[PDB]
Amino acid sequence: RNYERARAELNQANEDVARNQERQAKAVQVYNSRKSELDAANKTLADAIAEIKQFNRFAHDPMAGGHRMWQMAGLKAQRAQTDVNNKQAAFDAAAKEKSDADAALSAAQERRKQKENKEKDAK
């Protein structure tokens, strides 16, 4: 008698997990690009700071000429600092999406199992 009622709840549950697989797949595509850009920018910062330590012996002496290299190296560090701050904020926003979708998938999966058992009985 429940030839359709069991279907309707499972046929929904299989789309429920399908639309959710797409979420987690796109979420891992956003996450990976955001880690690779953060790792890229985090190092172009690390270079800049390592360039500072290299020149900050000229730092006290604004006539030295190397001081100019230390001066400019600070800007390299600062422009990179803003870059490691945006792409970190963007990566963190993309890291929530992966944790939320990995959980939402799991919660769609186990919810569907319940309706999958509500199939062998109703039919």
Partner 1 sequence: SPDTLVVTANRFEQPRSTVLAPTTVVTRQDIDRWQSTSVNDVLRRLPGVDITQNGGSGQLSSIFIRGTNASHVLVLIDGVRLNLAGVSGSADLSQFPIALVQRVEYIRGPRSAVYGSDAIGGVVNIITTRDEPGTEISAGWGSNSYQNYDVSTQQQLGDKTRVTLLGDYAHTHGDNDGFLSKTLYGALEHNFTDAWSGFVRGYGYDNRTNYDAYYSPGSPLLDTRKLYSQSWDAGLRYNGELIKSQLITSYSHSKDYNYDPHYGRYDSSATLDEMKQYTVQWANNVIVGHGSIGAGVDWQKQTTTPGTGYVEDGYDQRNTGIYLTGLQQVGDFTFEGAARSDDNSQFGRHGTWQTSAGWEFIEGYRFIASYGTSYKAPNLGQLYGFYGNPNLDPEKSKQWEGAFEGLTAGVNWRISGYRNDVSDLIDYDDHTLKYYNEGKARIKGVEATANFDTGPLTHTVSYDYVDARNAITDTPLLRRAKQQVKYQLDWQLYDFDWGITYQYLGTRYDKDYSSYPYQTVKMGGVSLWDLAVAYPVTSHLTVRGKIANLFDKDYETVYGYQTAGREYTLSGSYTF
**Site residues for partner 1 per CB under 8 A:** 49, 52, 56-57, 59-66, 68-69, 71-72, 74-75, 77-79, 81-82
Q: Is 91 exposed, middle or buried (0-12, 13-18, 19+ CB in 10 A)?
A: buried
Give the C-alpha separation, 51 to 69, whole Å.
9
Minimum CB distance to partner 1, residue 46 (Å): 13
Total number of residues shown for the chain: 123
Write out the DSSP string of 84-120. Answer: HHHHHHHHHHHHHHHHHHHHHHHHHHHHHHHHHHHHH
Minimum CB distance to partner 1, residue 103 (Å): 38
Minimum CB distance to partner 1, residue 44 (Å): 14
Kindly tell me which of 72 and 93 has the beta carbon lying closer to partner 1: 72
Kindly tell me which of 22 and 61 has the beta carbon lying closer to partner 1: 61
Instruction: Name residue 16's amino acid.
Output: D
Kindly tell me which of 15 and 61 has the beta carbon lying closer to partner 1: 61
